């Protein structure tokens, strides 16, 4: 499924991401935009053997299990397959656990290069929420 910007911001807000552990709502929209282009089915296989899954590109080495990944830790206790769905539930539930580590949103590399230190609330302006 490919979200529109305002569609994803209204969904991420119903999913409790507005101001979750100090991160305002535009951070989450800007992150989805550069990590997956708003696509719930995006997948990317990495240099290291891991694969990144879904709309928030959750990694198979630390967070979900894809059975092909070496030191797999499965912190979200979830098969990677469950994050490639149109329903954003599972991807939000795991992302809330990811951000609750001391590294915060720095675990999303596109967010670190394209959103941090930018006016992230622009990602939610012009929308009915």
């Amino acid at each position, epitope marked *: 499924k490919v979200f529109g910007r305002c569609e994803l911001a209204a969904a991420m807000k119903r*999913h*409790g991401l*507005d101001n979750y552990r100090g991160y305002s709502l535009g951070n989450w929209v800007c992150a989805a935009k550069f990590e997956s282009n708003f696509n719930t089915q995006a997948t990317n296989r990495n240099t290291d053997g891991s694969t990144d899954y879904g709309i928030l590109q959750i990694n198979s080495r630390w967070w979900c299990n894809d059975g092909r990944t070496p030191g797999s830790r499965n*912190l979200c206790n979830i098969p990677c397959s469950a994050l490639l769905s149109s329903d954003i539930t599972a991807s939000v539930n795991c992302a809330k656990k990811i951000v609750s580590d001391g590294n915060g949103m720095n675990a999303w590399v596109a967010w670190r290069n394209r959103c941090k230190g930018t006016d992230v609330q622009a990602w939610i302006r012009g929308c009915r929420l």
Partner: antibody, heavy 113, light 107 residues
């Protein structure tokens, strides 16, 4: 299946350091975030803190910095240290995973002369 | 620092009735609110996550709703094994906090 178990003394003196241990069985401690919760005598619950996978820690400010949470990956345990206890630290201490899915049985610690 | 207020503090009911418990947040926490049960001399038990997400192994008679600042836990036909303490907890902001508790007493 995961099981959690608290251990440590049940009676401590004012001003010493309370130390408790949480042994985890059924899965490695490297697969979750782990926390300490305590229940005061009138049903009052207090989330003390948690350690996350990177080793970073989150401590409740009500503790005033007397707490430390560390873990031992080879023993599969994690630990609570609480410095300079007073009679106000009298409570039932629980270990639990970060989301509240698994909890130990709880251990009543009494602080007294 | 989020304060969660639970009402009523005590609720007496007869087996087979339906009850509703409230948990109110002093600030908006979106859907970041979990409910636990605690029976006498037992550890807390997680019943509901994120305001309405159900959890395997829990009776279906429990469900939760609400968002922002106002949340509810309902129990359809309360059974005897339901009597004890009920607490809500927010995980939106550090420190995580708990509500004062509602007791469900057999009437």
């Amino acid at each position: 299946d995961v099981q959690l178990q608290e251990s440590g003394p049940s009676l401590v003196k004012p001003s010493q350091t309370l130390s408790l241990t949480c042994s985890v069985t059924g899965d490695s401690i490297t697969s979750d975030y782990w926390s300490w919760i305590r229940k005061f005598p009138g049903n009052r619950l207090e989330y003390m803190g948690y350690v996350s996978y990177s080793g970073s820690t989150y401590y409740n400010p009500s503790l005033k910095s007397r707490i430390s949470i560390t873990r031992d990956t080879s023993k599969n345990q994690y630990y609570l240290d609480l410095n300079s206890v007073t009679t106000e630290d009298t409570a039932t201490y629980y270990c639990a995973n970060w989301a509240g899915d698994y909890w130990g049985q709880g251990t009543l610690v009494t602080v007294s002369a | 620092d989020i304060v969660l207020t639970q009402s009523p503090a005590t609720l007496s009911v007869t087996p087979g009735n339906s009850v509703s418990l409230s948990c109110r947040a002093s600030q908006s926490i979106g859907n970041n609110l979990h409910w636990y049960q605690q029976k006498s001399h037992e550890s807390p038990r997680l019943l509901i996550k994120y305001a309405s997400q159900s959890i395997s192994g829990i009776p279906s008679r429990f469900s939760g709703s609400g968002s922002g600042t106002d949340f509810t836990l309902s129990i359809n036909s309360v059974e005897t094994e339901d009597f004890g303490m009920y607490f809500c907890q927010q995980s939106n902001s550090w420190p995580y906090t708990f509500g004062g508790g509602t007791k469900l007493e057999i009437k």
